[PDB]
């Protein structure tokens, strides 16, 4: 006994959202903007003379790369990369609400074709944003539940 989804991915209260960040042209502020536009919410930027709309302020983005395995002579075999994002919803009237995200990826290494192994890292850090910008949207229904209590 199953039924199709009847609610909306983004709750019915935050359908007019204000985005704010420190780098309005970076990669994350493009990924999140496109992802939000996909779900139907209209984004009125450039904070104006309206006070009825929840906001969303992004935060610190960090990427770390380090060894994860070694061959039988000391060299490196696999690298591992991590991203961490932080954001705070700011529902008007009440207090702020923090959310987070985290992604994991890995890839092998090749010292003989290094240049080709530098155009594979770029694709990885370009497509990791599309998941770090989806976890945040998936965490949105939790905020409304903590707002109705």
């Amino acid at each position: 006994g199953w039924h199709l989804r009847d609610t909306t991915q983004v709750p019915s209260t935050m359908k007019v959202m204000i985005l704010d960040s420190g780098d309005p042209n970076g990669p994350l502020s493009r990924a999140v903007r496109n992802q939000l536009r996909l779900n139907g919410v209209e984004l009125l930027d450039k904070e104006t003379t309206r006070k009825d709309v929840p906001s969303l302020r992004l935060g610190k983005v960090s990427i770390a790369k380090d060894t994860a395995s070694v061959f039988r002579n000391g060299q490196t075999a696999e690298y591992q990369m991590i991203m961490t994002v932080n954001a705070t919803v700011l529902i008007p009237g009440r207090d702020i609400y923090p959310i987070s995200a985290k992604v994991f990826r890995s890839f092998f290494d090749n010292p003989q074709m290094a240049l080709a192994k530098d155009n594979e890292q770029d694709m990885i850090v370009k497509e990791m944003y599309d998941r770090a910008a989806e976890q945040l949207i998936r965490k949105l229904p939790s905020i409304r539940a903590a707002d109705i209590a």
Binding site: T8, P24, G26, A68, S69, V70, Q112, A116
Partner: protein, 740 residues
């Protein structure tokens, strides 16, 4: 806790605090001559004495067990003196204490001249330990405590640890507070196995409010020559750099192991800049240059370790308004391993873009590139490249579905030159003018279901989202195009849905695939996901033939369900975790990769971990270069098992550990063990290591290195009040990561 335990040694001002000038404040006298427990209340300054005589130039003479209590100073002594004009007081031999922060001392003749906070002693001594504990002292003759900045001054200094002196050089200053002062620092030690000793001696500088300098000599007893290690830092309108330079005059072991050379020298150059000027321009530099291709095996740095294969050298410059881009980058490399040196490099690139997003119901996007490859040996081909990429979307949506029909049109025009050696030697011949035009087509989809779990958990909801895809890229022969920047990609569950098999733009494979996959998810009552499982396959209708299929699998099948994947993520509680992953391939007849993990994190000091990794030998045989399949060092794959731990003991100790087995051929790849004390006046730190290094050629036996660190610090006249655990848990070759 140690902080709260030590906090009950510093008295505090409980009386009401008054802010402003104290010269006009009222006077209270309790007892011209007053005899017997005379009390004075003048603002924050309070004085007590058996006898107080006021003589008015207002002079007050207090005699007999004279006390004192200011906002940040407490005095004691039999004889006292006072004056209200300059707020100056004189107190004879006694003891003094610092209130509001730690600090203790005694003297022979004190002084409290009201100008600023300069106090004077005559035979004093300034320590930083709580009363009743004699561990160390900074004994001098005249000491002036300045409190406008955070600076202290000492004359004829003689550092004493217990009842013994260990120092001289009279004019040295102890900086008490949290303001930067230009001075020396504390040394270290080591007993590594490559050089029999080690010694440092830093030096600090504070040129400007945003500037630094960290000149640091270094001893290398085995060699015999001091290796100077400069530094730099800054902060400006564009990011923050970390310039560095490590010179070394000459060596002896390098002159003995590697003879017949002009001179033996060493150097380095690090630079890491990353900032965003204004709101549009972007900048980036990642330079790293070394002298000899054995530096990292020798003396170690905090910017690169033994596990390394090359050294990146990249630039960047950027423009991005809201729907536009540009870039002029430059990537060059340097290969350490002196076996085969033919690495390529990229001269100025270019990346344009465009993002118009409202044409009818469709979308729009453009790309571009212009690169000029050059090789590092006079006879390998060099060429050029131009690219274009018009695309169009058509996104639909609903409450339970989606469709993402797509299109594209690729193009490229090389121009290769310097083709003599390669054409003469090998069979297939390269030409001087090629072109490539190939369309594309892709259809997507999605769905979502839901339920209210009646089973064990009441109020939990379960979802189940299927998926699908398609692909079509025609076949064009690509045997006349040298492989410059193409590599074979991996395929996890997330990478299953993709339109590219090779990275870069040099080789593009054909495709007729039909992907699939499902995903489930168990939500909590307050919409908190705590479960993700995933499966997914691929059905090749026709194999991918790029024109140069130089891959050697075991069974060579073309069509059929070939690839598989998996995933999991459990979130048992707030102090646990679990991850995973697995791949497969019917062309290898063996699992190709596998992960695992588990964690427990009560705080920043207690944690345990376990993990597993895998890579079948057929993977290293069908993906890595050809000499990785016959040597005894690489052919067997990776099957390592690890474990991490940390747990405070009592309330001052901390214990760390690590291990990394290798079950394919029983060995050991790491070991760390560092204890750490934390008292109320000093600290202690030890270390260890058993890292792998090098591969002896004679009898195929690896080489290990040991290490024993050592540290010490002066703690108590500062703000740092935490045990050093994270700073020590990130020192081995395979650092620790957070998998919670």
């Amino acid at each position: 806790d140690l902080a709260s335990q030590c906090m009950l040694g510093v008295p505090s001002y409980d009386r009401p605090l008054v802010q402003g000038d104290t010269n006009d404040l009222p006077v209270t006298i309790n007892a011209a001559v007053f005899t017997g427990s005379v009390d004075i209340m003048q603002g924050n300054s309070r004085l007590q004495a058996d006898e107080v005589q006021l003589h008015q130039v207002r002079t007050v003479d207090a005699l007999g067990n004279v006390h004192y209590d200011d906002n940040q100073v407490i005095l004691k002594g039999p004889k006292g003196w006072a004056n209200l004009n300059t707020k100056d007081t004189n107190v004879w031999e006694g003891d003094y204490q610092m209130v509001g922060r730690q600090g203790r001392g005694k003297a022979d003749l004190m002084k409290q001249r009201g100008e600023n906070r300069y106090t004077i002693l005559d035979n004093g001594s300034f320590t930083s330990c709580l009363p009743g504990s004699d561990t160390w002292s900074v004994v001098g003759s005249e000491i002036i405590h300045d409190r406008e900045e955070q600076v202290a001054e000492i004359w004829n200094a003689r550092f004493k640890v217990g009842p013994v002196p260990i120092f001289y050089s009279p004019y040295l200053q102890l900086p008490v507070g949290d303001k930067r002062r230009s001075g020396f620092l504390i040394p270290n030690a080591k007993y590594t196995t490559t050089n029999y000793f080690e010694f440092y001696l830093p030096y600090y500088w504070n040129i400007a409010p945003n500037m630094d300098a960290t000149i640091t000599p270094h001893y290398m007893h085995r060699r015999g020559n001091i290796m100077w290690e400069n530094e730099f830092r800054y902060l400006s309108q564009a990011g923050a750099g970390l310039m560095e330079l490590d010179y070394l005059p000459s060596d002896k072991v390098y002159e003995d192991e590697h003879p017949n050379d002009d001179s033996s020298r060493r150097w380095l150059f690090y630079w890491n800049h990353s900032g965003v000027m204004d709101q549009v321009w972007r900048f980036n530099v990642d330079y790293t240059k070394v002298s000899d291709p054995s530096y990292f095996n020798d003396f170690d740095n905090k910017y690169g370790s033994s596990t390394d294969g090359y050294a990146t050298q990249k630039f960047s410059v950027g423009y991005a308004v809201q729907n536009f881009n540009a870039t002029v980058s430059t990537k060059q490399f340097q290969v350490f391993s002196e076996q085969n040196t033919s690495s390529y490099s990229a001269e100025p690139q270019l990346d344009v873009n465009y993002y118009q997003n409202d044409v009818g119901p469709f979308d729009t996007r453009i790309y571009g590139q212009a690169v000029h490859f050059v090789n590092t040996r006079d006879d390998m081909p060099e060429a050029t490249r131009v690219h274009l990429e018009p695309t169009i979307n058509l996104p639909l949506s609903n409450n339970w579905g989606s469709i993402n029909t797509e299109a594209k049109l690729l193009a490229t025009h090389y121009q290769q030159t310097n083709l003599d050696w390669y054409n003469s030697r090998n069979t297939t011949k390269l030409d001087e003018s090629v072109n490539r035009v190939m369309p594309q087509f892709k259809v997507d989809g999605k769905m979502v279901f839901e339920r209210d779990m009646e089973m064990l958990a009441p109020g939990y909801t379960q979802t189940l989202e299927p998926r699908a895809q398609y692909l079509y890229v025609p076949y064009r022969d690509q045997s006349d195009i040298y492989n410059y920047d193409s590599s074979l990609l991996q395929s996890d569950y997330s990478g299953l849905f993709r339109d590219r098999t090779y990275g870069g733009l040099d080789r593009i494979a054909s495709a007729n695939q039909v992907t699939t996959g499902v995903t489930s998810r168990i939500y909590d009552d307050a919409a908190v996901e705590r479960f993700n499982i995933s499966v997914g396959q691929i059905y090749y209708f026709t194999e991918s033939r790029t024109g140069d299929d130089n891959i050697t699998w075991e069974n060579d099948d073309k069509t059929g369900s070939l690839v598989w994947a998996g995933d999991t993520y459990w979130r048992i509680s707030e102090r646990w975790g679990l991850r995973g992953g697995i791949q497969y391939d019917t062309r290898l007849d063996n699992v190709a990769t596998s992960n695992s993990s588990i964690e427990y994190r009560r705080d920043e000091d207690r944690l345990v971990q376990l993990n597993y990794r895998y890579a079948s030998p057929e993977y290293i045989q069908a993906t890595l270069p050809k000499y990785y399949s016959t040597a005894e060092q690489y052919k067997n794959g990776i099957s390592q098992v690890g474990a991490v731990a940390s747990w405070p003991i009592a309330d001052r100790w901390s214990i760390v550990g690590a291990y990394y087995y290798d079950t394919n051929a029983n060995k050991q790849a790491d070991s760390m063990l560092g204890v750490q004390y934390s008292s109320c006046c000093y600290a202690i730190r030890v270390g260890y290591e058993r890292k792998l290094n090098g591969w002896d050629n004679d009898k195929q036996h690896a080489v290990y290195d040991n290490a024993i660190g050592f540290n010490i610090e002066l703690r108590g006249l500062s703000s740092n009040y935490g045990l050093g655990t994270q700073e020590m848990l990130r020192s081995n070759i395979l650092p620790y990561q957070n998998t919670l």
